[PDB]
Design an enzyme around this catalytic site. Structure first.
Site, PDB file in Angstrom:
ATOM      1  N   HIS A  63       0.789  -1.243   0.000  1.00  0.00           N
ATOM      2  CA  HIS A  63       0.000   0.000   0.000  1.00  0.00           C
ATOM      3  C   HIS A  63       0.807   1.272   0.000  1.00  0.00           C
ATOM      4  O   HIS A  63       0.366   2.283   0.473  1.00  0.00           O
ATOM      5  CB  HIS A  63      -1.023  -0.016   1.155  1.00  0.00           C
ATOM      6  CG  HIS A  63      -0.417  -0.228   2.498  1.00  0.00           C
ATOM      7  ND1 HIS A  63      -0.057  -1.470   2.956  1.00  0.00           N
ATOM      8  CD2 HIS A  63      -0.074   0.645   3.477  1.00  0.00           C
ATOM      9  CE1 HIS A  63       0.486  -1.351   4.161  1.00  0.00           C
ATOM     10  NE2 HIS A  63       0.487  -0.084   4.505  1.00  0.00           N
ATOM     11  N   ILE A  75       0.129  -9.685  10.885  1.00  0.00           N
ATOM     12  CA  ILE A  75       0.156  -8.246  11.177  1.00  0.00           C
ATOM     13  C   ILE A  75      -1.274  -7.686  11.027  1.00  0.00           C
ATOM     14  O   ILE A  75      -1.931  -7.913  10.019  1.00  0.00           O
ATOM     15  CB  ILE A  75       1.104  -7.507  10.188  1.00  0.00           C
ATOM     16  CG1 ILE A  75       2.502  -7.998  10.368  1.00  0.00           C
ATOM     17  CG2 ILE A  75       1.004  -5.979  10.476  1.00  0.00           C
ATOM     18  CD1 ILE A  75       2.866  -7.760  11.737  1.00  0.00           C
ATOM     19  N   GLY A  85       5.007  14.077   6.947  1.00  0.00           N
ATOM     20  CA  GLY A  85       4.621  13.164   5.890  1.00  0.00           C
ATOM     21  C   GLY A  85       4.001  11.900   6.485  1.00  0.00           C
ATOM     22  O   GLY A  85       3.061  11.969   7.250  1.00  0.00           O
ATOM     23  N   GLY A  87       5.056  10.190   8.779  1.00  0.00           N
ATOM     24  CA  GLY A  87       5.189  10.105  10.201  1.00  0.00           C
ATOM     25  C   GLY A  87       3.849  10.341  10.885  1.00  0.00           C
ATOM     26  O   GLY A  87       3.020  11.119  10.409  1.00  0.00           O
ATOM     27  N   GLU A  94      -6.760  -4.190   5.939  1.00  0.00           N
ATOM     28  CA  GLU A  94      -8.129  -4.437   5.511  1.00  0.00           C
ATOM     29  C   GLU A  94      -8.437  -5.932   5.478  1.00  0.00           C
ATOM     30  O   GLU A  94      -9.599  -6.325   5.526  1.00  0.00           O
ATOM     31  CB  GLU A  94      -8.432  -3.768   4.175  1.00  0.00           C
ATOM     32  CG  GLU A  94      -9.922  -3.745   3.843  1.00  0.00           C
ATOM     33  CD  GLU A  94     -10.753  -3.107   4.943  1.00  0.00           C
ATOM     34  OE1 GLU A  94     -10.774  -1.871   5.005  1.00  0.00           O
ATOM     35  OE2 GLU A  94     -11.385  -3.827   5.740  1.00  0.00           O
ATOM     36  N   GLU A  96      -8.010  -7.903   7.741  1.00  0.00           N
ATOM     37  CA  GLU A  96      -8.619  -8.260   8.992  1.00  0.00           C
ATOM     38  C   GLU A  96     -10.091  -7.863   8.930  1.00  0.00           C
ATOM     39  O   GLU A  96     -10.497  -7.101   8.054  1.00  0.00           O
ATOM     40  CB  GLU A  96      -7.933  -7.584  10.166  1.00  0.00           C
ATOM     41  CG  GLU A  96      -6.492  -7.631  10.175  1.00  0.00           C
ATOM     42  CD  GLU A  96      -5.922  -8.969   9.929  1.00  0.00           C
ATOM     43  OE1 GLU A  96      -6.510  -9.991  10.337  1.00  0.00           O
ATOM     44  OE2 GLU A  96      -4.781  -8.995   9.370  1.00  0.00           O
ATOM     45  N   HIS A 113      -3.461   1.041  20.564  1.00  0.00           N
ATOM     46  CA  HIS A 113      -2.074   0.628  20.444  1.00  0.00           C
ATOM     47  C   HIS A 113      -1.349   1.377  19.295  1.00  0.00           C
ATOM     48  O   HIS A 113      -0.226   1.912  19.523  1.00  0.00           O
ATOM     49  CB  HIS A 113      -2.057  -0.864  20.123  1.00  0.00           C
ATOM     50  CG  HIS A 113      -0.685  -1.457  19.937  1.00  0.00           C
ATOM     51  ND1 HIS A 113      -0.036  -2.129  20.951  1.00  0.00           N
ATOM     52  CD2 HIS A 113       0.092  -1.510  18.859  1.00  0.00           C
ATOM     53  CE1 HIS A 113       1.130  -2.568  20.477  1.00  0.00           C
ATOM     54  NE2 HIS A 113       1.242  -2.187  19.222  1.00  0.00           N
ATOM     55  N   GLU A 114      -1.929   1.444  18.122  1.00  0.00           N
ATOM     56  CA  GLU A 114      -1.274   2.105  16.985  1.00  0.00           C
ATOM     57  C   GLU A 114      -1.032   3.574  17.241  1.00  0.00           C
ATOM     58  O   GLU A 114       0.042   4.099  16.931  1.00  0.00           O
ATOM     59  CB  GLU A 114      -1.981   1.868  15.673  1.00  0.00           C
ATOM     60  CG  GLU A 114      -2.061   0.405  15.265  1.00  0.00           C
ATOM     61  CD  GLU A 114      -0.706  -0.269  15.232  1.00  0.00           C
ATOM     62  OE1 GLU A 114      -0.618  -1.507  15.487  1.00  0.00           O
ATOM     63  OE2 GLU A 114       0.318   0.447  14.973  1.00  0.00           O
ATOM     64  N   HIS A 117       1.968   4.313  19.059  1.00  0.00           N
ATOM     65  CA  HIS A 117       3.128   4.418  18.178  1.00  0.00           C
ATOM     66  C   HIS A 117       3.145   5.761  17.437  1.00  0.00           C
ATOM     67  O   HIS A 117       4.196   6.389  17.298  1.00  0.00           O
ATOM     68  CB  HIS A 117       3.158   3.300  17.161  1.00  0.00           C
ATOM     69  CG  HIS A 117       3.396   1.943  17.735  1.00  0.00           C
ATOM     70  ND1 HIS A 117       4.412   1.690  18.634  1.00  0.00           N
ATOM     71  CD2 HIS A 117       2.797   0.769  17.466  1.00  0.00           C
ATOM     72  CE1 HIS A 117       4.400   0.388  18.929  1.00  0.00           C
ATOM     73  NE2 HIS A 117       3.446  -0.201  18.205  1.00  0.00           N
ATOM     74  N   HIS A 123       7.215  -0.634  22.235  1.00  0.00           N
ATOM     75  CA  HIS A 123       6.500  -1.709  22.842  1.00  0.00           C
ATOM     76  C   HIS A 123       6.913  -1.941  24.259  1.00  0.00           C
ATOM     77  O   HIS A 123       8.105  -1.799  24.614  1.00  0.00           O
ATOM     78  CB  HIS A 123       6.736  -3.007  22.082  1.00  0.00           C
ATOM     79  CG  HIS A 123       5.960  -3.106  20.825  1.00  0.00           C
ATOM     80  ND1 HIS A 123       6.417  -3.781  19.744  1.00  0.00           N
ATOM     81  CD2 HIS A 123       4.743  -2.605  20.477  1.00  0.00           C
ATOM     82  CE1 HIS A 123       5.520  -3.711  18.763  1.00  0.00           C
ATOM     83  NE2 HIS A 123       4.529  -2.962  19.176  1.00  0.00           N
TER      84      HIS A 123
HETATM   85  C1  LIG Z   1      -5.045  -4.550  23.845  1.00  0.00           C
HETATM   86  O1  LIG Z   1      -3.799  -3.996  23.393  1.00  0.00           O
HETATM   87  C2  LIG Z   1      -3.244  -4.276  22.171  1.00  0.00           C
HETATM   88  C3  LIG Z   1      -1.998  -4.888  22.139  1.00  0.00           C
HETATM   89  C4  LIG Z   1      -1.391  -5.109  20.914  1.00  0.00           C
HETATM   90  C5  LIG Z   1      -1.971  -4.739  19.722  1.00  0.00           C
HETATM   91  C6  LIG Z   1      -1.298  -5.077  18.477  1.00  0.00           C
HETATM   92  C7  LIG Z   1      -1.395  -4.330  17.320  1.00  0.00           C
HETATM   93  C8  LIG Z   1      -0.746  -4.733  16.210  1.00  0.00           C
HETATM   94  C9  LIG Z   1      -0.023  -5.887  16.160  1.00  0.00           C
HETATM   95  S1  LIG Z   1       0.650  -6.444  14.846  1.00  0.00           S
HETATM   96  O2  LIG Z   1       0.232  -5.746  13.649  1.00  0.00           O
HETATM   97  O3  LIG Z   1       0.237  -7.805  14.787  1.00  0.00           O
HETATM   98  C10 LIG Z   1       2.261  -6.389  14.991  1.00  0.00           C
HETATM   99  C11 LIG Z   1       2.847  -7.635  15.272  1.00  0.00           C
HETATM  100  C12 LIG Z   1       4.195  -7.648  15.418  1.00  0.00           C
HETATM  101  C13 LIG Z   1       4.980  -6.490  15.312  1.00  0.00           C
HETATM  102  C14 LIG Z   1       4.386  -5.302  15.019  1.00  0.00           C
HETATM  103  C15 LIG Z   1       3.033  -5.253  14.856  1.00  0.00           C
HETATM  104  C16 LIG Z   1       2.457  -3.849  14.621  1.00  0.00           C
HETATM  105  C17 LIG Z   1       2.431  -3.091  15.930  1.00  0.00           C
HETATM  106  O4  LIG Z   1       2.775  -3.693  16.984  1.00  0.00           O
HETATM  107  O5  LIG Z   1       1.995  -1.912  15.954  1.00  0.00           O
HETATM  108  C18 LIG Z   1       0.079  -6.666  17.240  1.00  0.00           C
HETATM  109  C19 LIG Z   1      -0.548  -6.272  18.436  1.00  0.00           C
HETATM  110  C20 LIG Z   1      -3.239  -4.125  19.746  1.00  0.00           C
HETATM  111  C21 LIG Z   1      -3.868  -3.909  20.988  1.00  0.00           C
HETATM  112 CA   LIG Z   2      -2.761  -9.183   8.405  1.00  0.00          CA
HETATM  113 CA   LIG Z   3     -11.765  -6.123   6.271  1.00  0.00          CA
HETATM  114 CA   LIG Z   4       1.567  12.158   8.969  1.00  0.00          CA
HETATM  115 ZN   LIG Z   5       1.438   0.982   5.919  1.00  0.00          ZN
HETATM  116 ZN   LIG Z   6       2.966  -2.150  18.089  1.00  0.00          ZN
END
Ligand SMILES: COc1ccc(-c2ccc(S(=O)(=O)c3ccccc3CC(=O)O)cc2)cc1
Ligand SMILES: [Ca+2]
Ligand SMILES: [Ca+2]
Ligand SMILES: [Ca+2]
Ligand SMILES: [Zn+2]
Ligand SMILES: [Zn+2]
Length: 158
Positions: A63, A75, A85, A87, A94, A96, A113-114, A117, A123
């Site tokens: 993407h 993921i 940009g 950042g 999608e 999921e 969580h995102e 970041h 983490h």
């Molecule tokens: C309830 O709290 C949460 C804890 C963790 C997440 C969570 C969000 C994304 C991912 S992930 O996309 O699978 C991922 C897996 C491994 C490395 C990095 C990622 C992306 C990330 O952590 O943002 C893994 C976990 C989401 C919510």
């Molecule tokens: Ca996926």
């Molecule tokens: Ca979807």
């Molecule tokens: Ca931005």
């Molecule tokens: Zn992306």
């Molecule tokens: Zn993460």
């Protein structure tokens, strides 16, 4: 690491997943930002046009950012730390199935969580932290940041 150097932060929902009602996407994202404004001086506003700080995108596979998504599972989403940009931007896979509840993958919890970041958090090794690397559903109506998440965000802001 990088942090936003201003208190008013904007986001925009680039596009909406067909998995959910529009109003429920809006609400989940809004509530997720509120988790963090609750414990920082940050204020978040949704904008409808123009360049936001945090662009929220649903996309699948490759993407345009060199971090392709991987189909269903694996993921779930990723986000870029503060910066110009790309950042700050937060991308949700999608492939999921995003939901308001315990079915599929909960968008609100994932977005909390995102956004962490997007604000500059890494983490946590604590399984009770929202910043723990592993997704697990918890009742979203009573959701609370862990002490470790609060210590992390307050090490960056406030
Ligand atoms: C309830 O709290 C949460 C804890 C963790 C997440 C969570 C969000 C994304 C991912 S992930 O996309 O699978 C991922 C897996 C491994 C490395 C990095 C990622 C992306 C990330 O952590 O943002 C893994 C976990 C989401 C919510
Ligand atoms: Ca996926
Ligand atoms: Ca979807
Ligand atoms: Ca931005
Ligand atoms: Zn992306
Ligand atoms: Zn993460």
């Amino acid at each position: 690491g990088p942090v936003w150097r201003k208190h008013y932060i904007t986001y925009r929902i680039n596009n909406y997943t067909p998995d959910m009602n529009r109003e429920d996407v809006d609400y989940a994202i809004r509530k997720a930002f509120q988790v963090w404004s609750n414990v920082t001086p940050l204020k978040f506003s949704k904008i409808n046009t123009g360049m936001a700080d945090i662009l929220v995108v649903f996309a699948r596979g490759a993407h345009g950012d060199d971090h392709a998504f991987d189909g269903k599972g694996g993921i779930l989403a990723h986000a870029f730390g503060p910066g110009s940009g790309i950042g700050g931007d937060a991308h949700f896979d999608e492939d999921e199935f995003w939901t308001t509840h315990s079915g599929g993958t909960n968008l609100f919890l994932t977005a909390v969580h995102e956004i962490g970041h997007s604000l500059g958090l890494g983490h946590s090794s604590d399984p009770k932290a929202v910043m723990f690397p592993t997704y697990k559903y918890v009742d979203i109506n009573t959701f609370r940041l862990s002490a470790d998440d609060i210590r992390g965000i307050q090490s960056l802001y406030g």
